[PDB]
Ligand binder design. Structure first.
Ligand SMILES: CCCCCCCCCCCCCCCCCC(=O)OC[C@H](COP(=O)([O-])OCC(O)COP(=O)([O-])OC[C@@H](COC(=O)CCCCCCCCCCCCCCCCC)OC(=O)CCCCCCCCCCCCCCCCC)OC(=O)CCCCCCCCCCCCCCCCC
Ligand SMILES: CCCCCCCCCCCCCCCCCC(=O)OC[C@H](COP(=O)(O)OCCN)OC(=O)CCCCCCCCCCCCCCCCC
Ligand SMILES: CCCCCCCCCCCCCCCCCC(=O)OC[C@H](COP(=O)(O)OCCN)OC(=O)CCCCCCCCCCCCCCCCC
Ligand SMILES: CCCCCCCCCCCCCCCCCC(=O)OC[C@H](COP(=O)(O)OCCN)OC(=O)CCCCCCCCCCCCCCCCC
Ligand SMILES: CCCCCCCCCCCCCCCCCC(=O)OC[C@H](COP(=O)(O)OCCN)OC(=O)CCCCCCCCCCCCCCCCC
Ligand SMILES: CCCCCCCCCCCCCCCCCC(=O)OC[C@H](COP(=O)(O)OCCN)OC(=O)CCCCCCCCCCCCCCCCC
Ligand SMILES: CCCCCCCCCCCCCCCCCC(=O)OC[C@H](COP(=O)(O)OCCN)OC(=O)CCCCCCCCCCCCCCCCC
Ligand SMILES: CCCCCCCCCCCC(=O)OC[C@H](COP(=O)(O)OCC[N+](C)(C)C)OC(=O)CCCCCCCCCCC
Ligand SMILES: CCCCCCCCCCCC(=O)OC[C@H](COP(=O)(O)OCC[N+](C)(C)C)OC(=O)CCCCCCCCCCC
Ligand SMILES: CCCCCCCCCCCC(=O)OC[C@H](COP(=O)(O)OCC[N+](C)(C)C)OC(=O)CCCCCCCCCCC
Ligand SMILES: CCCCCCCCCCC[C@H](O)CC(=O)SCCNC(=O)CCNC(=O)[C@H](O)C(C)(C)COP(=O)(O)O
Lengths: 506, 49, 155, 205, 78, 80, 192, 64, 93
């Protein structure tokens, strides 16, 4: 469904004129293409029949009930993502015309979705090195979609260079494995899992660690995310981790066949450092995107503890964690893209320059959100509280399940550190919540018509005109209550995680 | 014809082309050879029994 | 007296003293040529040509194309020599002493009465056995064609 | 009779008598000092060569300052890393196995010897606290059992029949002490007397 | 085959452009080429030094390993 | 003498120089693959090498396209 | 699990389309007109421009139908395929498949059909297209060749089940059917 | 107000400000900077994994 | 960034002024140009252009007839100092 219609959109894209109305409607056709893919995928793929794992395309791709779920997860997050460009987020043309200028924005997304879904399914090194490039290139193109901007282009150049180094590291490991065994297919290699050099699979992961931004390679991800536009950072900071953490888990599943003790220590060294850098890093920062970039590093650190442990409780922990962190990441970046309409306007100090690509860039631009839109602030507070881990939000069970798999395998040190880094991180999530509400009563009596939203003309002054678009507000409302009210369906949902199988069987 | 099977000189003598995570392991890490030496040693230990 | 070693020693020198973008481009060609020649002899003649037709014929003359649109501006000798001489002491990328210093042979067989070039086998496998790899690579090239325009074309 | 204090220690592979072949600290510490001396020293010269490749560029000089080890740090680290490995093994041999106390002692003394080299322009009280501070990180790491419990972990213990997979019963009272992760419904009284001690309500009042 | 044609030109331009540097890199190149011709045993011993320090299986260690196996099996017959 | 990261000295001091080093590094993995494919007398490895050359070709184009747009950005004033 | 009879592990493209139940065309009918409808409904949920409802351009209503057409076919294609694999109810299909395969054997013709592919390429085209529908959402691929790796035992078409004795079929032994593995290597074991 | 404040909010503010000051220097757009760390991490594979605790000790030393 | 402060301009301004015929060697912010230093049209232009060569700031035609004191020039440089754009090689590598 993707391939057939992606080519249709490519040809249809340049045939019609370049107008923001035609581009926006073409973006909606991107939403319809993704929706059909999900229905077609769900129709033919089931957890019951994929438990064994079914080889496809000359054993190049192998799909089982674990990789199948992440494919369904990837498609669903993309559906919510395209609602950010297929519909108005703010309503004001000045800030929303950035999403409608580039026609090939949706085309590039659909290129990446094909790369995103096939990456967990790779079963041969020949197709691994290809599929990683189809996804990797789509990231570099996406980061450079706004070529008029100076920061977005410099982000893609920095992204291209590091991603190429990671690709070479991944390529070199696969060539090294080929040189020892002479075989290509991963299932063939599994026969020789006891005789190949096991660290060559670690050199393969070191390439994949760079792409998801794990310490000590964290440096570039924070820089890139803090520079790309908010509409871009919402996609490049989450999607690559969805389709690579799954691939890392499958490789780690193979590596634990031999249970190499030396390999766990090296990866644990990276996990331990990441929690340190991801926690102490965000204490002294002023940018909101830089803070969420450090939050992403820490939550990638937590997930990798589950992946390293790699037992039957890891699947339950990793499946639940990746779903809940994805919705929360969508919820926060959906809110930050909407609360840009309450910014004050001058009528100077520090000469602070705010560009139309990232209207919300500093944390102190969230002031008095409790006053301006209290319901939105509570949704933002709930999302922030989930990342902290306040029970019974979705975030609490994420750490509860990771600790169960981490402690079950003897990761006592990393578990204690994961908790300390959870406490340290709470400082710079409370800072977001301090900004929103802590000055509410001292500013309850304020005279301020100097908001961005106040620019729009008064249409009738009698009919009730909502401040926000219908669709984007409904997504925030749907995701906010899922995080808060997960306690009802948690026992059933976790049962759904029990059924996910990766060669467990019996 | 009996000949050698070594890698091209450019592969192992370029100032840049010889540096990669797996090539350093081959050149400076004994972990690969210690395992693959045991198989060679087992050839002579498994004769007399 | 393998004269291949001397050429790399020269390239290992101009790479350290490279100053402007002229020198770096000439490093790429001076790396490709020892690659192409050492492959023409020894291992594989088909890929010695496939390097020249693609590496030099497509990318390297595109390197110098863009470089003319970029810019043209602007220890000693004993240290550079000392660095090379110490770097040259060990040149065995492997550490299997038995596998390096012992020669082997293969025995020819007359069963393959249908002798064909190595390219025919690659086509016989890339177009039938591994068609998915070929069709994905076409898809990647399609992405680049659309990708390269959107980045550069201002309008 | 001794005191009856709690014992909060994770299980470790106990090397019984006749095991624990000692490791030669003098040679083991020699490798660390010589190995770490070359890497920092060699990279020190390598970064010197980069300054002269281009210096008018701020970027190359900026990031080379981050990795710019001082002159004392070139001796401070190989001394500390060398002394850490000598003190760690040396205390291991007496204690017949690495513990948190042995690593805490080594990590503080190795830091203080190292700190007193490249932290001279600071009060000694500041250096001692840092040396004591860095000792606690390694003691905590060793108390927690390095990066993984290994065979002593619950999963490895469970797969060997030391877990609680088959449930519990109270008629089978084990005279031998139970395992670390094992649970039981009922326990011999003599084990409670050995742990809690007679006194405040055990056996007597 | 392109370097075989280009080698005569570049070697000439290496001595003309940087004569002092040429006399060393080419001079140093001839040393190792001679060294392997005449079995001087230098580069072999520079190699054996690295394998000893870095824990690799050296050539001498294998032959010592064979002696230990050889000495054990012979006394097993007795 | 590679553990002292000597190759960083050999890289030039421009963005275009970094691009060259990556392609040299990727070319090292193809020469190793052709070494492995030929000795084993395997044509599956030579298919891998053909893909590496083709894929690494596309990456070169995308990198220079970004660099050219990036370089045009500084000189993008276009007042006349 | 709701298993059934395994008709054909690698159903052919022409046979999958043939066995479309009337419901399957309805699904294709919905998807072809659902896509233009969903574009309309999106304008109902929120207009692209302004605050009032505005029907999208007629040009977009044409491309959306094309997306729905090639989108709604796969939902029909996947629905029919699950009946071959045994994942969906196939009592109607088993009756049809057994009648045709018996008719093929009765006429001394292969159940699968004549092929333009040498024995290797039949084997190769089996591995490429088998189970490709599990990725039919991501990108299309179909089994268009007349190969023989359908993962069945042809003797299951010999025994007569209930309600089949009326067809009055006579079936020769397998060593006499054109275009089969057992009836091809009679002179050289290397060549068909 | 003494040791329990040094081992508390006031003491931990100093340590956090010290460490976070060192970290914020590392995040700066430089291709050469990110290149060395990538190459540096390749030493983890080379070293025998008995030497992880020393690298951890060294890494803390460089924070100062 | 603009690394010049007020003192840095003032300290280096005197050295240029010490390089031209000045009635008094005591020059500070309060010191004038035409009065204290006795400079006419052509004399004053050379010093003003000279400060353009060191401070790298261009003085326009509007301020030409409106310059009366040396403190104004020192304060003017801060309001009009920028670093020249660095090529792609200098900035990021
Ligand atoms: C990320 C990148 C992604 C890349 C993806 C790229 C795109 C991938 C998708 C395309 C799939 C690629 C696979 C192509 C390789 C196949 C090559 C091959 O098999 O050659 C052998 C094959 C011939 O060998 P054969 O085994 O003897 O097959 C004979 C018949 O063609 C077939 O035998 P038959 O018994 O099934 O049918 C015979 C008769 C029909 O026989 C019947 O049983 C009648 C069925 C009733 C039809 C109902 C009405 C249909 C409409 C009227 O006529 C036909 O209908 C032929 C079927 C083809 C119809 C059109 C197919 C369009 C599919 C789209 O070559 C062909 O002729 C294939 C024709 C289709 C062209 C390619 C279509 C895909 C493009
Ligand atoms: C859009 C939300 C649609 C949810 C559809 C999820 C789904 O159907 O897949 C279920 C999947 C496991 O099911 P499976 O065994 O693979 O196959 C049977 C399918 N029922 O389970 C999964 O893997 C799903 C993983 C993602 C779960 C996301 C949960 C819903 C997300 C919140 C929806 C927000 C609604 C916003 C609506 C906006 C409208 C303007
Ligand atoms: C009773 C219950 C209480 C619970 C908490 C108890 C533990 C609290 C520990 C607090 C003790 C230290 C904090 C106060 C000491 C002051 C530290 C400091 O300010 O820095 C001093 C030194 C440089 O000196 P200077 O910058 O001039 O500061 C002078 C301030 N008077 O700079 C330094 O020396 C910094 C030392 C280097 C940093 C080493 C970091 C290693 C990790 C430390 C722990 C972090 C958590 C690690 C695990 C979680 C993350 C993985
Ligand atoms: C047919 C052979 C012709 C050879 C002509 C050049 C001979 C000099 C030796 C260069 C070959 C050694 C390999 C290194 C690549 C070149 C890198 C380099 O730095 O070249 C330097 C060259 C000579 O100038 P020089 O004074 O020595 O250095 C300082 C200049 N300011 O100054 C330059 O920048 C070169 C200007 C011409 C560039 C032409 C393209 C490069 C040559 C491609 C063909 C040669 C193929 C490689 C042959 C040697 C292989 C090891
Ligand atoms: C003519 C000879 C030419 C040789 C060319 C190379 C010259 C030497 C260059 C420096 C060499 C240092 C690395 C040595 C090889 C790598 C380590 C190794 O492979 O082990 C060798 C050595 C001892 O190993 P061994 O105990 O004998 O193993 C026998 C097992 N049967 O292992 C060691 O104990 C070495 C000591 C290393 C520990 C201290 C250094 C590590 C801490 C600083 C690392 C630098 C920062 C890196 C940070 C990582 C990034 C996250
Ligand atoms: C010369 C040898 C080079 C060795 C390089 C090793 C590479 C991997 C390092 C791992 C961390 C990656 C950090 C990114 C690279 C480090 C950059 C660097 O080393 O530069 C030093 C940097 C700046 O130092 P500065 O004082 O500002 O400048 C001095 C100028 N004369 O100072 C720093 O801020 C660097 C320290 C970053 C913080 C790392 C902390 C990691 C966690 C350590 C504590 C473990 C936490 C858990 C502890 C309890 C559990 C065990
Ligand atoms: C257990 C942790 C032990 C830490 C001991 C810290 C004791 C201390 O007070 O450090 C001294 C100094 C505090 O500075 P201050 O209170 O201002 O006294 C200055 C007097 N001229 O603090 C310093 O400036 C340097 C010492 C800080 C040590 C922090 C590193 C500890 C890392 C492990 C934490 C556990
Ligand atoms: C728990 C706190 C006390 C544990 C006992 C202890 O910390 O004990 C003192 C320890 C261990 O001493 P040892 O060498 O194992 O004792 C002798 C060995 N035997 C008894 C086996 C023969 O020493 C140390 O430096 C420990 C560093 C302090 C780390 C504290 C981390 C606590 C975090 C919270 C975990 C829930
Ligand atoms: C019949 C069974 C299907 C149910 C319908 C599902 C799609 C909704 C389309 C209805 C038409 C419409 O959207 O009409 C528009 C209305 C009202 O818009 P308003 O906010 O007042 O804007 C102003 C409009 N004025 C000017 C007319 C007043 O929006 C809604 O109703 C918003 C409801 C959000 C979608 C709820 C579905 C969530 C499904 C979750 C699955 C994961
Ligand atoms: C094992 C026993 C556990 C007991 C509970 C944990 C210790 C209590 C710490 C509370 C600190 C607090 O609340 O943070 C408040 C403090 C400072 O306060 P401030 O608002 O800036 O006021 C001071 C204003 N000055 C300084 C401008 C004058 O911020 C911080 O330093 C932020 C970092 C906190 C680190 C938390 C790490 C937790 C590790 C716990 C495991 C050892
Ligand atoms: C590199 C090649 C270099 C080649 C170089 C070439 C130099 C070209 C020389 C230009 C000569 C030109 O024809 C004449 C001229 O400059 S027009 C001045 C005539 N003046 C009047 O007609 C009355 C007004 N006079 C005043 O305003 C004052 O006299 C004064 C100008 C000094 C102000 O100063 P202030 O009052 O002290």
């Amino acid at each position: 469904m993707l391939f057939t219609s992606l080519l249709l959109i490519i040809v249809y894209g340049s045939l019609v004129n370049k107008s923001h109305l035609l581009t926006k409607l073409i973006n909606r056709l991107g939403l319809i293409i993704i929706i059909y893919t999900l229905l077609i995928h769900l129709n033919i793929n089931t957890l019951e029949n994929l438990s064994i794992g079914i080889n496809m395309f000359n054993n190049l791709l192998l799909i089982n009930s674990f990789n199948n779920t992440i494919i369904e997860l990837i498609l669903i997050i993309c559906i919510l993502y395209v609602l950010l460009i297929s519909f108005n987020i703010t309503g004001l043309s000045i800030i929303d015309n950035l999403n409608y200028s580039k026609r090939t924005f949706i085309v590039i997304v659909l290129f990446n979705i094909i790369g995103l879904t096939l990456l967990p399914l790779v079963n041969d090194i020949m197709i691994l090195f290809i599929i990683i490039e189809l996804q990797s290139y789509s990231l570099y193109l996406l980061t450079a979609i706004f070529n008029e901007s100076h920061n977005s282009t410099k982000s893609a150049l920095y992204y291209f260079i590091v991603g190429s180094i990671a690709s070479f590291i991944i390529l070199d490991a696969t060539v090294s494995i080929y040189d020892d065994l002479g075989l290509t297919n991963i299932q063939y290699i599994l026969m020789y899992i006891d005789k190949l050099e096991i660290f060559d699979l670690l050199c393969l992961l070191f390439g994949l660690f760079i792409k998801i931004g794990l310490a000590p390679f964290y440096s570039y991800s924070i820089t890139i995310y803090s520079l790309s536009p908010t509409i871009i950072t919402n996609y490049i900071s989450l999607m690559p981790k969805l389709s690579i953490l799954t691939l890392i888990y499958i490789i780690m599943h193979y590596i634990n066949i031999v249970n190499n003790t030396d390999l766990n220590y090296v990866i644990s060294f990276l996990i331990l450092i990441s929690m340190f850098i991801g926690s102490f890093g965000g204490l002294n920062v002023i940018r909101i995107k830089t803070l969420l970039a450090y939050s992403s590093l820490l939550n990638v650190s937590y997930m990798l503890l589950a992946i390293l442990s790699n037992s039957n409780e890891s699947i339950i922990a990793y499946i639940y964690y990746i779903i809940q962190y994805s919705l929360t990441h969508i919820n926060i970046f959906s809110i930050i893209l909407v609360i840009s309409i309450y910014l004050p306007i001058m009528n100077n100090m520090l000469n602070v320059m705010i560009t139309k690509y990232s209207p919300i860039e500093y944390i102190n631009q969230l002031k008095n959100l409790f006053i301006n839109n209290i319901f939105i602030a509570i949704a933002l507070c709930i999302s922030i509280f989930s990342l902290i881990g306040i029970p019974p939000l979705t975030g609490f069970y994420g750490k509860y399940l990771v600790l169960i798999s981490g402690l079950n395998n003897g990761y006592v040190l990393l578990s204690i550190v994961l908790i300390i880094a959870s406490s340290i991180s709470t400082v710079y999530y409370a800072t977001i919540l301090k900004v929103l509400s802590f000055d509410t009563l001292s500013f309850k009596d304020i005279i301020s018509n100097n908001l961005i939203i106040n620019t729009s003309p008064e249409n009738n002054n009698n009919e009730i005109k909502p401040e926000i678009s219908n669709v984007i507000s409904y997504v925030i409302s749907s995701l906010t209550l899922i995080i808060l009210l997960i306690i009802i369906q948690y026992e059933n949902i976790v049962k759904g995680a029990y059924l996910v199988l990766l060669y467990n069987w019996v | 014809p009996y000949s050698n099977t070594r890698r091209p000189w450019v592969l192992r003598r370029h100032i840049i082309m010889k540096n990669s995570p797996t090539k350093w392991a081959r050149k400076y890490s004994s972990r690969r050879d210690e395992r693959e030496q045991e198989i060679k040693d087992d050839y002579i230990r498994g004769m007399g029994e | 007296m393998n004269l291949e070693i001397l050429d790399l020693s020269i390239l290992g020198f101009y790479s350290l003293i490279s100053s402007n973008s002229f020198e770096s481009i000439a490093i790429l060609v001076a790396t490709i040529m020892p690659v192409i020649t050492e492959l023409w002899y020894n291992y594989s003649q088909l890929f010695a040509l496939l390097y020249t037709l693609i590496y030099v014929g497509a990318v390297v003359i595109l390197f110098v194309f863009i470089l003319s649109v970029i810019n043209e501006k602007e220890s000693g000798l004993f240290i550079l020599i000392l660095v090379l001489l110490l770097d040259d002491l060990d040149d065995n990328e492997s550490n299997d002493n038995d596998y390096n210093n012992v020669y082997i042979t293969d025995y020819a067989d007359w069963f393959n009465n249908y002798n064909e070039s190595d390219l025919s086998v690659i086509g016989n496998l890339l177009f039938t056995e591994y068609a998915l790899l070929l069709l994905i690579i076409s898809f990647i090239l399609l992405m680049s064609i659309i990708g390269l325009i959107l980045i550069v074309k201002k309008d | 009779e001794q005191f009856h204090l709690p014992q909060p220690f994770w299980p470790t592979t106990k090397t019984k008598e006749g095991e624990y072949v000692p490791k030669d600290s003098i040679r083991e510490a020699s490798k660390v000092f010589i190995g770490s001396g070359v890497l920092l020293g060699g990279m020190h010269f390598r970064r010197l060569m980069q300054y002269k490749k281009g210096s008018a560029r701020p970027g190359l000089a900026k990031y080379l300052n981050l990795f710019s080890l001082s002159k004392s740090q070139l001796i401070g680290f190989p001394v500390a890393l060398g002394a850490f490995s000598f003190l760690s093994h040396s205390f291991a041999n007496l204690q017949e196995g690495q513990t948190a106390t042995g690593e805490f002692a080594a990590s503080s003394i190795a830091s203080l010897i190292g700190l007193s080299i490249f932290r001279t322009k600071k009060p000694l009280s500041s250096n001692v606290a840092i040396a004591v501070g860095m000792g606690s990180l390694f003691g905590f790491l060793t108390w927690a059992g390095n990066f993984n419990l290994g065979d002593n972990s619950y999963r490895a213990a469970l797969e060997a029949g030391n877990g609680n997979e088959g449930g519990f019963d109270n008629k089978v009272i084990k005279t031998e002490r139970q395992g670390f992760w094992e649970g039981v419904y009922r326990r011999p009284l003599s084990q409670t007397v050995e742990d809690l001690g007679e006194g405040r309500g055990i056996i007597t009042q | 085959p392109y370097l075989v044609a280009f080698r005569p030109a570049v070697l000439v331009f290496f001595f003309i452009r940087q004569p002092i540097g040429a006399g060393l890199l080419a001079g140093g190149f001839l040393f190792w080429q001679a060294d392997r011709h005449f079995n001087f045993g230098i580069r072999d011993n520079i190699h054996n030094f690295k394998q000893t320090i870095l824990g690799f299986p050296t050539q001498a260690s294998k032959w010592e390993t064979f002696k230990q196996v050889d000495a054990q099996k012979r006394a097993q017959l007795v | 003498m590679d553990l002292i990261l000597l190759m960083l000295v050999a890289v030039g001091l421009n963005i275009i120089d970094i691009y060259i080093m990556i392609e040299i590094l990727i070319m090292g993995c193809t020469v190793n693959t052709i070494y492995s494919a030929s000795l084993d007398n395997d044509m599956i490895g030579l298919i891998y090498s053909l893909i590496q050359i083709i894929i690494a070709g596309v990456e070169s184009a995308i990198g220079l396209s970004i660099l050219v747009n990036y370089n045009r950005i500084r000189n993008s004033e276009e007042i006349e | 699990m709701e298993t059934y009879e395994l008709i054909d592990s690698d159903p052919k493209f022409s046979r999958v389309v043939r066995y479309f139940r009337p419901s399957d065309y309805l699904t294709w009918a919905l998807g072809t007109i659902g896509a233009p409808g969903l574009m309309v409904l999106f304008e109902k949920i929120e207009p692209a421009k302004g605050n009032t409802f505005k029907m999208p351009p007629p040009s977009i209503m044409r491309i959306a139908t094309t997306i729905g057409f090639f989108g709604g076919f796969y939902y029909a294609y996947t629905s029919s395929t699950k009946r071959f694999w045994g994942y969906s109810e196939n009592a109607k299909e088993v009756a049809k498949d057994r009648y045709e395969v018996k008719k093929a054997l009765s006429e001394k013709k292969s159940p699968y059909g004549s092929s333009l592919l040498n024995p290797y390429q039949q084997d190769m085209s089996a591995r490429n297209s088998t189970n490709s529908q599990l990725l039919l959402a991501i990108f299309p691929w179909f089994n268009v060749a007349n190969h023989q790796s359908h993962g069945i035992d042809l003797r299951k078409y010999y025994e007569v089940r209930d309600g089949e004795e009326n067809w009055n079929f006579t079936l020769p032994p397998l060593d006499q059917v054109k275009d089969l593995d057992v009836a091809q290597y009679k002179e050289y074991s290397n060549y068909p | 107000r003494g040791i329990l404040q040094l081992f508390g909010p006031l003491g931990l503010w100093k340590l956090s400000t010290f460490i976070s000051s060192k970290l914020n220097k590392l995040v700066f757009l430089n291709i050469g900077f990110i290149l060395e760390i990538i190459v540096l991490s390749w030493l983890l594979i080379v070293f025998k994994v008995s030497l992880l605790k020393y690298i951890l000790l060294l890494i803390i030393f460089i924070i100062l | 960034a603009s690394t010049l402060t007020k003192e840095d301009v003032l300290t280096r301004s005197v050295s240029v002024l010490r390089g031209f015929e000045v009635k008094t060697k005591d020059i500070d912010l309060q010191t004038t140009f035409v009065q204290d230093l006795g400079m006419d049209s052509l004399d004053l232009n050379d010093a003003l252009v000279a400060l353009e060569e060191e401070f790298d700031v261009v003085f326009d035609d509007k301020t030409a007839n409106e310059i009366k004191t040396v403190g104004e020039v020192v304060d003017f440089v801060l309001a009009n100092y920028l670093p020249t754009e660095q090529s792609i090689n200098h900035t990021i590598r």
